[PDB]
Ligand binder design. Sequence first.
Ligand SMILES: Nc1nc2c(ncn2[C@@H]2O[C@H](COP(=O)(O)OP(=O)(O)O)[C@@H](O)[C@H]2O)c(=O)[nH]1
Ligand SMILES: Nc1nc2c(ncn2[C@@H]2O[C@H](COP(=O)(O)OP(=O)(O)O)[C@@H](O)[C@H]2O)c(=O)[nH]1
Ligand code: ALF
Ligand code: ALF
Ligand SMILES: [Mg+2]
Ligand SMILES: [Mg+2]
Ligand code: NA
Ligand code: NA
Lengths: 336, 333
Amino acid sequence: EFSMEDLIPLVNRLQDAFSAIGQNADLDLPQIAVVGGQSAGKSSVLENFVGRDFLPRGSGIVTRRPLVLQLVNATTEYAEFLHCKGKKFTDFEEVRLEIEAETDRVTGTNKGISPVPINLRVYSPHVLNLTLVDLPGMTKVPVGDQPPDIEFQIRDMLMQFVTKENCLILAVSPANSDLANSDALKVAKEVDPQGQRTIGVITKLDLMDEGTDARDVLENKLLPLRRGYIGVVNRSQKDIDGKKDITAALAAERKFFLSHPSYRHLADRMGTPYLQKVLNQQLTNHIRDTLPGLRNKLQSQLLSIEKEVEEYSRVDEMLRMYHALKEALSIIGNIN
Amino acid sequence: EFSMEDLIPLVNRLQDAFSADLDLPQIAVVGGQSAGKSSVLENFVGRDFLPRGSGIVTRRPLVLQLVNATTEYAEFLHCKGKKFTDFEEVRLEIEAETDRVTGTNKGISPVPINLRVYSPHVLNLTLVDLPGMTKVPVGDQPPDIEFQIRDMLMQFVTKENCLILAVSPANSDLANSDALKVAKEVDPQGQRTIGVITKLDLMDEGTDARDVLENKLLPLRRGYIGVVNRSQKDIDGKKDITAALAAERKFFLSHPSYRHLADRMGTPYLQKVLNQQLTNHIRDTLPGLRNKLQSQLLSIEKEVEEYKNFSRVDEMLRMYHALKEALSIIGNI
Ligand SMILES: Nc1nc2c(ncn2[C@@H]2O[C@H](COP(=O)(O)OP(=O)(O)O)[C@@H](O)[C@H]2O)c(=O)[nH]1
Ligand SMILES: Nc1nc2c(ncn2[C@@H]2O[C@H](COP(=O)(O)OP(=O)(O)O)[C@@H](O)[C@H]2O)c(=O)[nH]1
Ligand code: ALF
Ligand code: ALF
Ligand SMILES: [Mg+2]
Ligand SMILES: [Mg+2]
Ligand code: NA
Ligand code: NA
């Protein structure tokens, strides 16, 4: 009867301890990271997991730092950032502003990026028990005052997440561009050739040119993926501006698939609700099969933290990682 | 007084004789797959002869020589002696010839298809249609298709007299532009890169490309020109060029973010600018062209000098005469 719930007690502690001191890139915990070109609609897809407006979204470069989003099912609903402990947020608009402010603090407002992640934990009776990673979208040419190698700084940042064995890759591609043009799929095939942990998501289906559709892609025929593709339709910029809510966006999406002559026959396997259901199941299957591997990785990190203790505030930080790992090992050893 | 018309007697003689080493003036399109490149080039003629569509369509370079003339017809260097009057047959030939040399359903070939179109409504210049860049192979395409396509483009855009039409679709952030990335690589100073923004009619409600079109997001010396070409539905319905141009004109005049730029937007404006830029570009580098020709003449002269017996020989002589004639012509301009 294994589920993500069983991992919650250990994931929670480990994330605090490691990400707190900039070592987030050490743990190989189960998570789902979003990859794709700039403005493909990645943050819009992730935001739906919470059901509230809280992630900065928009055309042009908006997400500029990774966001490690820990979702925990709980009776009450509130959010907390690792960078400002003690402060609990109930207003999701204020959560959005803090992500924007924390991003600007480090990356400025002249379009730069930073691989330092913002860690946010959200407790809600409506969410699944998953960790999502929002990431800046891949680009080809620098604009404004971005550095000349911005494309590679962005790729490097994403690679650090997606090369991990327990990271499910959500390869996001916009319907209004040929799939052959997909930066998400190129990246995904490079790190996960067999497609064992890659899921395709086609966004912006409502923006396709008249007389065309993505049926061949959605039926998994154009470029087959082991895990298939799921189509979604999120809010346009006009919608965001006009304050259309998620409940209304979801209804428009359901109607879109049921009434589109190219997709009606696939409607049951399309949409945001379906994507979230499938992602949860896929992550559950992945970790169920890789639990021994996770235990062995934590055993390795523990061996590593021990050696580091003897080499020596920084002591407190290391001890917190040490105890979280010891506890994680005990908890995981009891999971079947 | 100098105009592309002055080069017609020269360019045609040379092209015919040479069958690269010739750096003749031309305009090449670069961009991601299905950015709208072939659709842009087709407007230079207006006879639905270029295969267009979503998915990979253009799969071989097409070197298209346009010549203003009283009669309208076309010739393919590979179909010697046959003059095409039916443009649908022309479109079908491009398709068949593409299948012939690529030898695959979706792969490409860098061997160009040479086509010349005579028409009373065309400018006098050469356009090069090219497959769009991709990232992942589909169907029977080779695993390195991305690099085979980039290599193919490079064959044209590294040339000194090749103007680069960097085509980027408006429905994708400019920062994602394969076109501008390649243009910057082969032409850092932008002396020969002209930006074209297609699919302006497809942008998400609530957004616009004003900063791109005002040359502020990623400035180019030559600027950016926005166009609105026919959709796939329109193509399938055979919408004519006249209707497409009127809808384009209406789009810019009615869009609140672009109306103030209307006099420098659109297909007619793009073609005027392209012609002028190509004319200026070659007018200023004419002595350079002359030397390029002269070096090939002097070279071939020595070899042809000892010719005195008795179709490689015939081909060599034709190049000699063509080069010798071109030299005289250019010398008078
Ligand atoms: N019409 C439409 N617009 C969308 C869709 N998904 C996202 N957008 C818009 O695309 C832009 C980019 O969204 P964002 O989620 O910030 O993408 P990200 O940069 O890749 O995280 C915003 O202006 C969204 O309103 C979609 O399915 N349909
Ligand atoms: N709505 C719209 N569709 C366009 C526009 N330009 C091209 N298209 C469509 O985009 C697709 C690609 O056109 P094509 O010229 O073949 O691009 P190429 O592959 O880059 O040569 C076709 O389905 C065209 O109908 C445009 O400005 N607006
Ligand atoms: F704002 Al982005 F990829 F363009 F998150
Ligand atoms: F058909 Al293309 F670039 F996709 F010419
Ligand atoms: Mg984002
Ligand atoms: Mg084409
Ligand atoms: Na964006
Ligand atoms: Na195409």
